[PDB]
Structure formats: structure tokens, C-alpha cells
Symmetry: C4
Subunit: 405 residues, 4 copies
Amino acid sequence: PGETKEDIARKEQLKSLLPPLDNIINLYDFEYLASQTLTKQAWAYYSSGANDEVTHRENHNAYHRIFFKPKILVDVRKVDISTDMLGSHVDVPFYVSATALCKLGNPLEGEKDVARGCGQGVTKVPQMISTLASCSPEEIIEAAPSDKQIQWYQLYVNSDRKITDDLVKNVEKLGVKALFVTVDAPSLGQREKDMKLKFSNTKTNVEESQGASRALSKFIDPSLTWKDIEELKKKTKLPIVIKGVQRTEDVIKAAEIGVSGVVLSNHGGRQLDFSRAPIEVLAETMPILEQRNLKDKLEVFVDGGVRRGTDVLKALCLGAKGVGLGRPFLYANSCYGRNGVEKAIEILRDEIEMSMRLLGVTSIAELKPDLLDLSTLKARTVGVPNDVLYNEVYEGPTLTEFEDA
Amino acid sequence: EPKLDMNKQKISPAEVAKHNKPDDCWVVINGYVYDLTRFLPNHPGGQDVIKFNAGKDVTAIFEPLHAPNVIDKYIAPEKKLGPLQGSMPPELVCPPYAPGETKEDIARKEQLKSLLPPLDNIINLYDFEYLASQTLTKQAWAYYSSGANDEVTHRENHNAYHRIFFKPKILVDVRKVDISTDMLGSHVDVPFYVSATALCKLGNPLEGEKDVARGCGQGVTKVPQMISTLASCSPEEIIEAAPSDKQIQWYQLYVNSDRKITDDLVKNVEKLGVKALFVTVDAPSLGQREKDMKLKFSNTKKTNVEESQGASRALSKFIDPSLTWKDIEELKKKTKLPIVIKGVQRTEDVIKAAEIGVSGVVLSNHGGRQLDFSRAPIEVLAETMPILEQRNLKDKLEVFVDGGVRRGTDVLKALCLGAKGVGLGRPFLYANSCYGRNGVEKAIEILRDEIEMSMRLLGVTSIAELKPDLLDLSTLKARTVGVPNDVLYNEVYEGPTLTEFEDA
Amino acid sequence: PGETKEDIARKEQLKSLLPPLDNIINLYDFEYLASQTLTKQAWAYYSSGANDEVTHRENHNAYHRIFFKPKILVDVRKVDISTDMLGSHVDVPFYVSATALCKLGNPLEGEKDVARGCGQGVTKVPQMISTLASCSPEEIIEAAPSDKQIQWYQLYVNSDRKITDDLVKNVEKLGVKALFVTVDAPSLGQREKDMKLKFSNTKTNVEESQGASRALSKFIDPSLTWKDIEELKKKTKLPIVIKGVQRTEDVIKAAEIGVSGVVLSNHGGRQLDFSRAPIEVLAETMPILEQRNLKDKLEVFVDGGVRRGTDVLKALCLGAKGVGLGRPFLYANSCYGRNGVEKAIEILRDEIEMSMRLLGVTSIAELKPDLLDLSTLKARTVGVPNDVLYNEVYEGPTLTEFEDA
Amino acid sequence: EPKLDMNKQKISPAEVAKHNKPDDCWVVINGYVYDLTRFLPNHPGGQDVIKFNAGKDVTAIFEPLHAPNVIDKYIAPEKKLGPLQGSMPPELVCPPYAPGETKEDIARKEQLKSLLPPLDNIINLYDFEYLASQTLTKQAWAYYSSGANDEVTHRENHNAYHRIFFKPKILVDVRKVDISTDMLGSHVDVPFYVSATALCKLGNPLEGEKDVARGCGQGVTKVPQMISTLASCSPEEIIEAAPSDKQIQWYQLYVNSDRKITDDLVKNVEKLGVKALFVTVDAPSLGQREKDMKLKFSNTKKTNVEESQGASRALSKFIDPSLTWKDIEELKKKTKLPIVIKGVQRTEDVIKAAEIGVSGVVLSNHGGRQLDFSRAPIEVLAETMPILEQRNLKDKLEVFVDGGVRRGTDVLKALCLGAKGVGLGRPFLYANSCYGRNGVEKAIEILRDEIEMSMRLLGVTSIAELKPDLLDLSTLKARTVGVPNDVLYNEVYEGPTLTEFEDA
Ligand code: HEM
Ligand code: HEM
Ligand SMILES: Cc1cc2nc3c(=O)[nH]c(=O)nc-3n(C[C@H](O)[C@H](O)[C@H](O)COP(=O)(O)O)c2cc1C
Ligand SMILES: Cc1cc2nc3c(=O)[nH]c(=O)nc-3n(C[C@H](O)[C@H](O)[C@H](O)COP(=O)(O)O)c2cc1C
Ligand SMILES: Cc1cc2nc3c(=O)[nH]c(=O)nc-3n(C[C@H](O)[C@H](O)[C@H](O)COP(=O)(O)O)c2cc1C
Ligand SMILES: Cc1cc2nc3c(=O)[nH]c(=O)nc-3n(C[C@H](O)[C@H](O)[C@H](O)COP(=O)(O)O)c2cc1C
């Protein structure tokens, strides 16, 4: 914590003042509400990124370097946003990514409420479950209200492989439909908001408890290699997706060892700062795949900074099989539990359908590159420092004013 | 007053208050009863406002915001039940439409309205915007000023103009300049026009679209007026208010899913004398303007979600989402009026328009109220015109643009690129809202003067002389998104400071 | 005015608190002091630009799109910043440009104090005199303390040519050394700060007193043409410079009709808004001249937004014969009269010498293009609108804080 | 204590107070009298501070800011007059040097100093900066944090790093990583070093440069220390304070106009054991740091200007402005120590350095304290290294960079481009100012950890594996200057807002 007596007071009062879920307009509304009501600990843990949080923000910003070239006078009365992911039919082209410790924001239900929100309405959304979920995989998969809802397991390979061996067999038996092996966290990203929180709140055996090593964990084997993945292919039938690819070279390697897909991701900017926006790695990757007809050998997903239907649409047009979101659902789930998640799903689903009509296409398969203006995709810029004295003494024009009372 | 049959079984203040449910909605408007149940899902203004005022007397909401002809033209006769007997409980008759408007806002605003500066003191189009932002009801200001979703395109429409600079000619005789031109076969005094916008009555209750008509045709400088199919005034009263016979009026058309209504409407406006039809194609689905939505919510713990309708709520029979190129070809065969396709957002579709032979297109994204991340039309114009020429198609299609135009230099830049004319929406709504018809006229003078003055400094003397070589287009594509700012580095950094006066 | 009783009160008190001239560090200091002490009328008149004042600011900003490629290990003990302009030797590579109505900020002396500041110290700076100066040309030229100081006359050709005829003969007889004919003001730029001032302070014969025409004046003939300049060449011996060129095409025409030079200028951004930064037109112009050895046929000057020695140095390296400044001197002259002007001259002179040593060259002639990095000269950018909701709800990292008292 | 001849005609508190003029300046330092008249124009600290305290006892200003050896090494014996007799009027003996420091600032700051957070709670290098900004005297903070003129380059040094992104490798065994490397013939624990900075005593009065020496060599991780010719400590005490024999100390050299002093100094530091000589060439003239100047003015109508000296005031015999390439060639012949040219700002000069055969260069602009608009060294490095290879010259010259480095990822980016090592100045001055030697050590741990942690995520395990293919350099040249913001448009515009809580 580090949560005062009056901190708890103010927050329970704010949660009682949460607006009606019917009044939430977009995914940022959940984020705002969450920012005022979660404990300092849960907020820092969910909202933080690595170091200067540049990548975390760039993930979102890069989407804005892409504009649309919509078609008009196309019959868009009826549209469809369902598609297939990893051999299963899905109602939407997005999914809930794995996020550890959902109980920080939703103590009673944690990941269970996410499972429920994902399957309780007419729209069924796939849920990725973190190896580090605060609920057990059994209880999470059991809370899923529908048999038609997909659940994927995000796997962290343990240094003690036998634990992973047992884990993989357990989740497979439980029904998950795929394994997403996270490879962008061999060392823990440094999330300074958390750390600052812990210091303001106020070690006997050496060896691998000092400096950089403090960011290593036996839980997440830092020596995981391509060979290990090849091995994993032989020990399971579940489709395998490598989560955390950050360069085209590694997408090519994934195809070469024949896994089912990759997730171009930088862990929501929580790992290596200055890793590129996945939307940008995607734009570079897909064309290169086609130039080797790896076209369909590999399904390419992306996550990071997706907050609008139009963000999703851009990824789809570039060729992403699906688009993942982490924080928005966390916030929705933390403020309004399962219903919050359901509402988040509706908001994103309606955003995609609506803008799909304005783009002039009627199905996910019709989302193609020609629908995008990619001409300014590389305009990732850093301005020359502002001329302080010049702009400080300068006085800009002013608007006309009303007469004196 | 609607053409209701006053010879029908009168109805009672009790049998009405009954039907106040989404599937059995009855309402009273000026002593008459209507079954609006089948209607609401298509209400252009949203079903919610009708839903949450069902079974009640709604005249105070309805009357000041609608064209005199909507019940006639859009409600099925069978649905016009009959005369109401008496009144309605005082708590069952709705008050004026002013979502979130407090008694204190009304107070403060009527006072500010008395303090509006003299129209002679208005310098530029932003002044009207400022004044309007402080005096309109929250609802009117939201409805006029909102854009779709994050309002990026709305802003980008304007910003993109700043990616273009001028290459002016000096030592050219510019004593005399002329800014008149021709558009769609008619001579026009200026190269700009007032674009279609619905609900002009929100900011100008007494006159709405009619004062726009007056402002555009009363002075020495006349400007073309485009009339929205969804105007708050009828096309006959708008056209009749036109002070001059030489002023141009265009009709913006929304094709109905019921093509008979559109066929009748086209014949009607053509008989009324509009000079062209601008068919809007960028709104098959309603853009989400969150400022409005928020305002409507502020009124109206852990969960409630049940029968929330989807993306279908943004569809309406008033704007047929199935409109296609074939429909436009058919439209050409039913009218002698020049046809312009309004809402083109890519060169491919400007080519298709040339191919089916319509008169022109408006490169537009509806003022950024529809698809967010649609490009600035000025940028689409830059790409389009050269491509037309690489096929002579230039002069085969008149290309207009709108969106974010606030300065005469913005107009000049579009003209140099080859636009036939430039449209403006919001600025005129603000001018009309604050100062009525004379506001519209003042706006016209401001923009006219801005175009002539800067035309002299550009070194040309007529619209036909505005060409691309007058522009520096080298940085037109420098539409950028910076790397996120380094928060810690910039927070702790202290910049240079100016010298200061000696202590008193 | 529009100057209250308490406005005058506050200002006379502020002027009495002006810091010692020895304490002025750079040209912005004069601007700040001037902004607090001049009358609203004088401040609006001097500080305003046309319309949205984009060009006025861009004039300065474009200099920052150029960096230096300085040479080290060069003997820079002794340096020299003198050069020649229009056939005369000058101590510095800059000059005071014409500015109308100097008496608004300096009521007692106006342009006379500029003449004095320009010639009273060891550094003699050329002064350009506005046809619309608030002092007569005779009194201004007479106030010049030195015979070695240069004075140029900025000419506005009158609709009544005979007046210009007489004017040209008069200034020539008085000793001015050149004629700078202003061609960027056939119509008056709209300076909204002025106008706003006049409206808050609260027409009988038609014809050419309405709308756009109100910006025309018989004083400044709007029908001036190249032919007229050709004529002017035949009626005077003084070198002729066309002031207000804004495109290379017109620099080429100047060479063709054989005038002495041009001033790439947009009137300090007071005329046509969105006219380019002269520094940028210069970078494009000089190479094109050489590709026609017009190399030395025409002397090319520039003004607009020059506030630092390094700004001057950039212009010189690109090939400008001299660099003009308007507002800074106005401010200096308005706050500290002639001494203010002298101090401004020292500040700019020392800035140029000092940075010249760091650039690794020792004379104006050694300032060349290879000293500049022009690779980002065209990075004049306009960002995509800021994502308001995303950045508003986002919370950036924070610095560590001191312990509680 | 200086080596003064205590056998000279004593002098009196009256014959001293006399010489208080710029051309007859006498001062007393620790009971001795000196004729500093010929000296002041060359005083590295500016002539003004000596001028305006002439004829007085200045020990309180002098003593805490200078190396123990400056009167010995830089004042002519003849100018060391003799012993003073008695004292000096209490109003003729200067107080500590604290320009603009009010009694209340001293109060507030000594209190904040007691409230400094535990060193274990410092997370990154910006924390030291923040803490230092609140606790140093105005003079010390200005002197450390200022840049030249508009401080653009100072900021650009840092900003340019953000124009580079990473292309990390995944699924690589990164259990073990090593960040040691070699620099100028010596093995180093890390790929970074503490760069030369004068006046470390400003922020650390008791230890200055000696605590830097300690911080750099006391822990398990040792870092190279570059010593300024203008350090506030003597080279012998700085080198003697070094806790470890394995720690590296480099000497930053400023060639004197009097080459005999330089010849002696080079021989002295070489005998003391420094491992290299970094000759600084980017300061022939003193950069103008306006924050300092302003501070000095705040103390000290229409005019006074008379004998104001010019650009010459920025020259000093301590830094020979006539240093040339030939001088460096000669220097090679007088020492066995590796020579590095510090302050190279363009590729042409890196080539010239290879040609004369020195050991390396530091691409640097002196932390943005010299020429404003000098480019970010990280950008010069990107251009330089490939060009070296297109001539094999790589490996012939070790290329270091400094300026604006605050994160391990900044270091990693320079290493991938081919830098042999990366220097930091300010961060260490702030760490040393707030927490002394342990602060320096903590800074070293912070940066070390940052390099190792991100190295693992980059997918490599040693310094030698840091290569260009690990970097995305596609936007390295996107150094931009936006069009001026449209003030009126953006002022009147109202952005989207977040939903809000229900009223209490
Ligand atoms: C008789 C049938 C009706 C027709 C044809 C009609 C048509 C329209 C149209 C064209 C608009 C403008 C849409 C736009 O902004 O583009 C509008 C707005 C509106 N209408 Fe109606 N309307 C009808 C009945 C009603 C009724 C019965 C109510 C009862 C409360 C109502 C309340 C409103 C309101 C409040 C708005 C403003 C909505 C907003 O933008 O916040 N209308 N209507
Ligand atoms: C005995 C001869 C002296 C030598 C060799 C000497 C040398 C230096 C050096 C190398 C610096 C650091 C310059 C830098 O920042 O790079 C300095 C700063 C300074 N010196 Fe001296 N100094 C001498 C005498 C004096 C005297 C007599 C005073 C008397 C008041 C004085 C006052 C200062 C002050 C105040 C500073 C700090 C200036 C600032 O940055 O604001 N020095 N000196
Ligand atoms: C609080 C939090 C916890 C996370 N935990 C995991 C995890 O345990 N395993 C994993 O593979 N990714 C994890 N992620 C990363 C997400 O799966 C995903 O890559 C990221 O959230 C996408 O970016 P976004 O938050 O902007 O949508 C986490 C992200 C957050 C914000
Ligand atoms: C409040 C408002 C209502 C509008 N209503 C309509 C309409 O009914 N039909 C139509 O074709 N366009 C409509 N438009 C779009 C305009 O015709 C035009 O595309 C746009 O306003 C140009 O952008 P601007 O407001 O930045 O000048 C509307 C725009 C606004 C701002
Ligand atoms: C208050 C003011 C008055 C001016 N008057 C004239 C004038 O009468 N004639 C002329 O040719 N230029 C005139 N100029 C423009 C200057 O000669 C010069 O082009 C401009 O000041 C350069 O830009 P700067 O102010 O940023 O240095 C004036 C500028 C200002 C600011
Ligand atoms: C307060 C201060 C004093 C400095 N003194 C010297 C010096 O005496 N000699 C030298 O070669 N460089 C000197 N430098 C420059 C540094 O060696 C180095 O180039 C610079 O600090 C790197 O930039 P950074 O501060 O952003 O890390 C100084 C820098 C600062 C900030």
C-alpha cells in the first residue's frame, strides 16, 4: 500500500460515485475512473511502463502516423467483423491480452470477472490468461459462462522445465486453445512508478540478489531459446504463438521453426524502452512475409496502445490476424468488474463496425492496405529544443472580447 | 402547421400518458397525437430524445428545432392519430431542449448576449467562434463544434493548410483584383460558399437557415448557400427568404432508403430553383460526436448492461447506407441539375465520379464529424488534381473542398491547387448564431477582404491566375507525430529567463 | 492610445526601474523590457505581424532547422567580422533595417537616436531609413555622429511619381549610399493586434474607401512594376536594391534588369502570411545563382527573425551579403534610446565574433556552406493534432522527493 | 599552502586597500599580498570577480573554490609581494561566494539538505538532478546546469538519442551478460566514464574532485575519471585519493598560451600515472552561459556604455586559442600517453585526427556549453563510423561521445553505433554535490544496472555484440522545427473531456 486512512476514505466514496456504466463512452473513460479509484499500488502496477515510458506511449502514437483512404458509395448496410484466429471462429477481431494480478483492481473476482465479461454477452471475446494470473487457471476457465468462448494460455517457461511440462499439460487438459509463449521478459522491465511507491514506504545470502540480477527470476527462464520452442512443438498439439517479437528477423525465424504465429509486442512498453511501436513493425513485416509467401504460414497478432476501433482497423488492414488489448480491460474490470469488461467489449465492437462502414468495406477480409495512407508512417519525429526566450517574450494574437459589464 | 385531419376521434390526456414505452411510443405535438413508435429508430436526432419523452407533450422540444414540413413529409398518415382533448399534466409536458443548461447558465448567457461587441469590431472568423462558445447553450455549442471520436481529422483539416507556404510574385501591378469565378455553370462573386449544416435554429431560433439565405444574398457580395436535407427550415421558406435573384442556392441531398421520398424531394427542390444537387456520401453511418453524448448523459457502481443496441443505432432510413455508384448514375437520368458527389476522401473515387460523368465532387470528410483519420481534403486535393490532368479529366469535373477553412489564405491555397470553390460550415453557423443574417454577411466580407488583400500580395489579379507555381508544396507531406516527450528530463530542466526590472 | 490613467502610472514607474544597460545580455532582454514599458499602441504597432503571425515566427524558427559543422584545431586568436556591402566597407555583417514611426517608442528622438547609436561607438553600423520615418531624412542624416557611417534610404514609390522623383533626388543629395525599394507592401498587411486596440477605443464620399481598398494607399503605388525599376536605374546613380523578394524567380529577374541587389524579406512577417522564411529562400537562391555565375552580379541581403549572432552567421555562410534586423533595434531604441542601440550593436557584434571563433574561421569571407549542416532545412513540420483524451488521462513519471519536514 | 617567501618587506592594510582599480589590482589571500593586475584578464573565472573585490581580503571567496596549487603554478613570483601586517577592515574582507544567495535561501537549503532522501531511494540520474536543483546555491546550480546562449545544443544532445529506436533479438540466452570493455589500452568494468568538469568544490566544498575519484574507484564497479586542467583540486591530491590501483584516471588538458606550463603539466600528470591525455579543442573562446551572467548581474533608465571590452573578454591565456593540428602532432612526440582530441564536431575532423595518428577523439560539444547549434554527438557518431570503415580507419581511432547521456539505453545506442566509450558530466556533478563519493558510486550502479538490464532485453551478452543492426536508424534525421502554432484556432478550440464521477 502506502495508502493513508483518508486515501481509503476518499476512494470508497469515489467508487460509490462511479457513473452508470451506460454512461461510459470510450475506453479512456474506464482509464480515468480507474486512475481515481484504484489503490496507489494497483494503479502504479497497471499504468506503468519501463523507464521513461517512451515505448508505452509510442505504441499508441504510431497509430496516428496512419490515415485512411476510405471508399464511398459502397453498400455498407450490412457489415461483419467476425474472423478466425488460430483455427477458431471469433465474433470480433480483437482479444483480451494476458495481464498478471487482476485481483489488485478486482480483489473478489480478478481474472474470473474477465472470463465472465468475455463470454456473458452476445459478443464472445477470446481471453489470454497470464501464467502469473492471480486466480488459478482452473477457476478462471471454469468461470467462463459459454462453451463457445475461447481461452488462450500465456506461458512463461520456468527455469525448472518440469514445472512448465506439467503446466502445459494441465492447461491443455483444461481446454485452452493455444499457447502464447512470452519472450520479451527474460529480465524484468524497470517500472519506476512502482518503485517510487515502495521507497516512500520504507539481503543475507549472496550470489544473484544484487544489481541487474534482481531483475532475473527462476520463474522466467532467461535462457529460453529458439531450440526450446522447437522442443515445445513436439510436446504439445496446441498451436504455439511467440509473444513479444520486435523485429522482422524474428518473425522470419518463427516461420522457419513452424510455430503457428507471433505477437508483435513489447509487453505494453513494460520491458525494453525504445522498442518500436508494434503497428510499425507490422507494416514492415507483412510485405516481407508475402515476398516469401510466408503469407499464411504464420498468423501475426499485435498489441500495445490500442484504444480505438480505428486503431484495430489499421492493424487489420496491414494484415494482423487479431489485435490485443491489455490495460483498457484491466481498468474496465477494476471499476465495473465483469459488466465493465462486457461494456468495454461493446464499445470496441461498435467502434469497429461503425468505422468499418465509413471505410467502405463489409467484412474483415476486405480490410486491406489500399484502405490506408501509409505515406507518413515514418514521420516519427523529435523536434529541435524550443527557443525558450523567443517564445516566452512573444505574445500571440487574442480573441475579440465581450463588452464590459 | 401540418396537414392533419381534424375529423378523427379525439384522444385523451390519459390514453396518451399511457404509451410511454420504446415499443409503444405516443407523443403530442401542438394538440395532436402521433404514434412515433415505428419512427424513432430512424429519427435523425436519435431515438433517445423521443424515447425518454414518450407519452408526454413534447411541443417545447420539437417546435423550435424542426422544419415546418417534417410531420407532413415523414410521418405516415395512419400514424397521425387525431386531436388531443384538453392538455396534459404540467409534469407531463416537456420543457425547452437545453440538456445540462442550468438556470444560472441561462442567466449568464443572456447577459453575455447583451454584451456582444459591435459587429464592426469583429476582425476574423475565430471571433465569431469565441463569442458563440460563450453564448450558445451547451447543447448547441456541442452540436456545432464537435467532431467524430478524438476529433483528429477535424483539426487536421485546418492544420494541413499550414503545411503549405506561398511563393509570391513581386513588382506586379496589383491595383485591381477580382475574386469572382464560376461554379457549376453559374457566375459567383467569390470563390467560397456556405456549406450545408442541419439545425441552424439551435443558434438562431427565429430564423435559422433563412438568415443564412439573407446573409448570403443581401449585400453587394453574394455567396452560394448549400441547403441541408436535414435543415431546421423547409426548403421553400429558405429559398423564399433569398433577397436576391442573382444569389445561388444549392441543395444537399440525403438519399432516403425510401427512394420515392427522394424522387419527390429532388423534383420539389428543382422546381423551387436550386442550381445543383450535392449528394452527401460520407455519412452512411452517423459519426460519433462524444461531446454531445457526454452532455446527454450528464442528465438522463459495478455494472448494468442488457439490451444495448449496437452499431445499428447509428443507421437511419433518412440516410440510405446502401447508396452506390449505380444510384448516382440513375440520379443523373432523373434531373437536369448538375450533380456533385459530396464527401469524397480519396483520388480513386474522384476518378470514378469522372467516369460516371457527374458534374463534380467535394473532397470532404464532413468537417471531421464522420470517419476519424480521414485525411485533410486540402492534401487530397493536392494529390488529385495532377492525376486528373495526367488524363485531361481536369475541367471534366469541378472539384470543391471543405473543412477547416478559416482564413482567406486557406482559400487561396485550395484555389491555387485547382479547387473550383471552397466550402465553410462552422464559421457561418457561429456568425449566424451570434449576429443573425448580418453576422453571415460580415463573415462574407471578412473572408472576401482576406482573399483580395492576400491575392494582391501573392502577385496575381484574378481567380484564374491562382496556380500551383504560386505555392511551395515541398513540405505538404510533413504530417508528423513526435516521439513521446521525455517527462523527467524536461521537468527538471530550467530554461533561460529574461532580464527583469529593478525592485520597486 | 487606449492607455488608462493607471496604465501611464505603472509604465513611468517601470521605466524608472529599467535595469542598467550593462545588465542587458541579449536582444530578447530589450524586447521584454519594451513589452512592459511601451504604450499599448506602440507595442502593438511594433510587435505585430500579419494575420496569424505565422511567417513572423517562422522567420526565426527556420534558422533552427540549420546546424553547424564547426572546425576545431584552427588558430582563431584573431578574427574579423568586417565586410563590404553595396560598394562600402562595413565594420559588421549586419545592419539596422527601416522601421516606420520610431517616435512611438522614442518620442523625443525617434530615428535620430538610431542614427546616433549606429555611429557613436567604435562599431559603425549601416542604418536603413524608412520613407515613413517619423523624423525627416535631413534631421536623421544630420544626427549621424560619424562621416564613416553609412545610411541607406528605403523608398516607397508614390502613385504621384513626381513626389518620388523629388524624394530620390533629395536623399541622394543628402548622402545616402543606396536606395532600397520596398516591393512587398503594395497593399497593407492586416496587423490584428493594432486593430483590436483601436476597436476597444470606439466615411462620407465613396469610391476606394471600402473593403480591400482600405489597405491601398496613394502613398505606396500598388502598380509598381519591373519596368518602373528599370526606369529608376536611369534616373539615379545610387545602387538599387529590391527589398521584399520572396522567391528565387524574382531574384533572377532582379539580376536580369541589373539592379545592385535584393533583400529576401517578407517585411518581418507583416505583409503576406505564409510567405517563407527568408533564410530558407536564401538557401535555395544562392546555389541557383552560381549555376549561372550571377554569383557576384547581385548582392543578396536577408532580414526577418534574426536575434542571435549565430542566426547572422548562418545567413553569411549561405552567401548573404548582409543581414538586417528591425524589431530588436526598435526595442533597444525605445527603452534606452541611442545608448540602447549602441548596446544592441555590441551584443550582436560580440555574439558573431565569439561564435565565429567556435566555428573555426577568422573572416567573413571564410563563412561558407560547408560550415553548415543543411540536411534538415526542409523539416518544416505540422504535427497530427494531439490525442487529447489519451494524453490527459496519462500520468508521466515523477522525480524523487525530499523527506517530509 | 603556497610556497611564498616569508622574508619580504611586510605590507600594510592601507597600502593594499589602495590598489582597488582594474589597472592596479592588489588582493590579500591568507595573510599574503598579491599583484593580480596583469592576471585578471586571464583569470579562468572571469576578470569581473577579481576586479570588483580588488584591494580587499578575498580569502573567503578564493579558498573554497581553488586547487591548492594555483598561486604556485600560475602567479609570477615577482607578483607575490609579501606578508600582510595585521588584518583588513571588516568591511574590506569579502564574504563567501554566493551571488544572489539570500539569508533565507541558505536557511531553506540547509533544511532541504537534511531532508535528502536515503541514497537507496534514488532511482535514476534525473533524481540527483532534481535534488541538486533544490539544494545547491544559485551560483553552483547555474554554473553546473547552464548551456551556451539559448541552450539548444545542450538539449539536442539528449533529444537526438530519442530519434533512435531498438531492433531487439528475442529467444537468445541472456542469463549472463558482460558490460566491461577496453578503452585506450586499459580494461574497464563499464563502457562509460566520468568526464572532466571544473569546480567540483562548488557542490562538494570539502572534497570536490577527490570524492569523484573515490566514488569511481571504491566499489566493485570502477569507472574511469577524466580530470579537468581547471579542477578545483590539484592533480596530485585527486590521483592520491584514488582508492584502487586498478581504477583509471585520465587527464583533460588545456594547452596554455605559455607552452612551458603545458610541457611541465604534461610531464607532471604522466609521472603521476594518468593513462591518457584528452586535449580539449572546443573552447578556444569561452561559451556564454547566460544563467550565470544573469545571476552575477542581479547584484553588481536610458543608457550607460563606454569601455565595455569585446569578444576578447572570452579569451584567456589558460586556453590558447591558437592551438592547431600541428600542435597536436608535436604533443605526440613529447609523451608516451595515448592522446585523444576532445571536442570534435564533424567527420572531417575525425579523419584529420586519424591522419595525424592520435589515439582517438571525443565527439563532443562540451555539454552544449560552447557553440550553440553544434549537432548532437550521437548523430555525428552515426555519420562518422561508417565513413571510417569505408577506409578501414575504424579500429585506428577510438571514438568516444558525450553530452546528454542520462540512461543506459542512451549508452547502449552509442555503443551499437561503434563508440568505444560514453562520457557523462552533469549527472555525476549532481550526484557528487548531493551525496558526495557515495552519490557518485550510486550513480555508477544505476547506470551500470540500466545497461545490463536493457542489454539482456536487446538480446546480446557483451559489449562487442552491440552492433548497428540492433538499431533502427531510419528516423535519425527527423530533427524537426514545427510551423508556428495557430494561436487563435487552438485557443478557441475545446478538446474532448473524460467522463466524470457523480456529484457527491
Ligand atoms: C415528426 C418527425 C420528426 C422528424 C422528421 C425529425 C427530424 C429531425 C432532424 C432532421 C434533426 C436534425 C438531425 C441532424 O442534426 O442532422 C432532428 C433533431 C432533433 N429532433 Fe427531431 N424529428 C422529428 C420528431 C421529433 C420529436 C417528436 C421529438 C421529440 C422530443 C424530436 C426531438 C429532436 C431533438 C431534441 C433534436 C436535436 C437532437 C440533438 O442533436 O441533440 N424530433 N430531428
Ligand atoms: C591565484 C590565481 C588564480 C587562478 C589560477 C584561478 C583559477 C580559477 C579556475 C581554473 C576557475 C574555474 C574556471 C572554470 O569554471 O572553468 C576559477 C573560478 C573562480 N575564481 Fe579563480 N583563480 C585565481 C584567483 C582568484 C582570485 C584572487 C579570486 C578572487 C575573488 C578568484 C575567484 C574565483 C571565482 C568567484 C570563481 C568562480 C567564478 C564563477 O564561475 O562564477 N579566483 N578560478
Ligand atoms: C498490468 C499488466 C500486466 C501484464 N502482465 C503480463 C503477463 O503476465 N504476461 C504477458 O505475456 N504479458 C503481460 N502484459 C502485457 C500484455 O499482455 C500486453 O502485451 C499489453 O498490455 C498490450 O499493451 P496495452 O496495455 O497498451 O494494451 C501485462 C500488461 C500490463 C499492463
Ligand atoms: C453542425 C454541423 C452540421 C452539419 N450538417 C450537415 C448536413 O446536414 N449535411 C451535409 O451534407 N453536411 C453537413 N455538415 C458538414 C458540412 O456541410 C461541411 O462538410 C463542414 O462543416 C465543413 O467543415 P468546417 O465546419 O470545418 O468548415 C455539417 C457540419 C456541421 C459543423
Ligand atoms: C514596426 C515596424 C515598421 C516597419 N516599417 C517598414 C517600412 O517603413 N519600410 C520597409 O521597407 N520595411 C519596414 N519594416 C520591415 C523591416 O524593414 C524588416 O523587413 C523587418 O523588421 C525584419 O524583421 P525583424 O523585425 O524580425 O527583424 C518594418 C518593421 C517593423 C517591425
Ligand atoms: C559544470 C561543467 C564544467 C565543465 N568543465 C570542463 C573542463 O574544465 N574541461 C573540459 O574539457 N570539459 C568540461 N566540461 C564538459 C564535460 O567534460 C563534458 O563535455 C559534458 O559535461 C558532457 O555533457 P553532459 O553534462 O550533458 O553529460 C564541463 C561541463 C560542465 C557541465
